[PDB]
Amino acid sequence: MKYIGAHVSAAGGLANAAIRAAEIDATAFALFTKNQRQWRAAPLTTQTIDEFKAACEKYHYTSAQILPHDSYLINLGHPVTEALEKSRDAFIDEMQRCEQLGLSLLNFHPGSHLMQISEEDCLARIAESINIALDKTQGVTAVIENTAGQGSNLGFKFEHLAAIIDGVEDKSRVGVCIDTCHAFAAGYDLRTPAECEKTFADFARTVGFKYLRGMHLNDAKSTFGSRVDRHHSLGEGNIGHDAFRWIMQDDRFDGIPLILQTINPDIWAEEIAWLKAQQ
DNA sequence: GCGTCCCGACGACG
DNA sequence: CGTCGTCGGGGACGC
Ligand SMILES: [Zn+2]
Ligand SMILES: [Zn+2]
Ligand SMILES: [Zn+2]
Numbered sequence A: 001m002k003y004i005g006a007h008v009s010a011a012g013g014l015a016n017a018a019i020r021a022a023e024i025d026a027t028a029f030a031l032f033t034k035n036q037r038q039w040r041a042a043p044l045t046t047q048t049i050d051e052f053k054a055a056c057e058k059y060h061y062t063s064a065q066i067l068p069h070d071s072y073l074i075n076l077g078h079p080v081t082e083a084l085e086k087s088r089d090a091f092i093d094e095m096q097r098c099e100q101l102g103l104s105l106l107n108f109h110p111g112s113h114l115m116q117i118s119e120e121d122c123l124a125r126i127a128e129s130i131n132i133a134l135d136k137t138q139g140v141t142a143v144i145e146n147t148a149g150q151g152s153n154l155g156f157k158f159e160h161l162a163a164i165i166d167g168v169e170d171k172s173r174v175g176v177c178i179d180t181c182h183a184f185a186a187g188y189d190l191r192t193p194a195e196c197e198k199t200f201a202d203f204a205r206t207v208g209f210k211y212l213r214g215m216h217l218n219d220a221k222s223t224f225g226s227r228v229d230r231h232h233s234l235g236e237g238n239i240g241h242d243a244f245r246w247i248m249q250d251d252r253f254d255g256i257p258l259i260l261q262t263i264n265p266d267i268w269a270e271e272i273a274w275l276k277a278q279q
Numbered sequence B: 001g002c003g004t005c006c007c008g009a010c011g012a013c014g
Numbered sequence C: 001c002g003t004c005g006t007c008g009g010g011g012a013c014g015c
Helices: A014-023 A046-059 A081-100 A119-135 A158-166 A180-186 A193-206 A241-248 A265-277
Strands: A003-007 A028-032 A066-069 A105-108 A141-145 A174-179 A212-217 A257-260
Touching (some): A003 A265, A014 A046, A028 A257, A066 A257, A081 A119, A105 A212, A119 A141, A119 A158, A141 A158, A141 A212, A158 A193, A180 A212, A180 A241, A193 A241, A212 A241, A241 A265, A257 A265
Parallel strands (some): A028 A066, A105 A141, A141 A174, A174 A212, A212 A257
């Protein structure tokens, strides 16, 4: 069993997301529990929480099929203590918000040294940031997403994820989410079944599939090793459809939210359908 | 320096 | 009432 969806919109309320997900026949969906470009959001009201749950229950979307993503503003590895504290508070908020909504996963970006600390220093801060949050919450698993490696942003090498995990105490609540566009941009080839098997065997060796808690199926507008984060619709980009079919036929990707973040939402229904047809 | 990439609340419009 | 535009304000790309 595979859960295929997209990062649908939460405009007008979290329940709408589940509704939007159902409208395109998704068996999985991602969302923002609050605007990802602002520091503060009004606390969830029991009304919003209830409606969201009613919506999810109506369509049978279980916690294992939902992959909320945190704020863009958060840097769990910020070189400046004050800004790091702020990022930490926010991240804690996002995780507490997931607990209220009965969501067990939280997709977030690793962090950036902003040319002001070393890589180790930045990674250890991320580890610390996670321990701190898993310490102030329950039931929510921190899912680290690999990145394209733009600017001073870490997490483009599988080794960064493995190092961040080594520093986490409660390994039961830490995981990873692989974004095809990001891995490709980082330098992990996927343009053929052969490369996919190779790129994922590597992932298996340095991180291990027991930590995979989600996927981001994006094609790339950016190029191999460009370390540029620019997505594209499935098959219209530099990666191609082969990789996505390959993924759909590999059982190592079962029981997790496979989320589309392709550039044209209007064709998400077709993309979701095509992906399913690949199994 | 500015438009655009990795959006949801809400006020102004019509 | 539906829809659009602006604000918010981290880190970046590429011109
Ligand atoms: Zn992401
Ligand atoms: Zn992604
Ligand atoms: Zn991306």
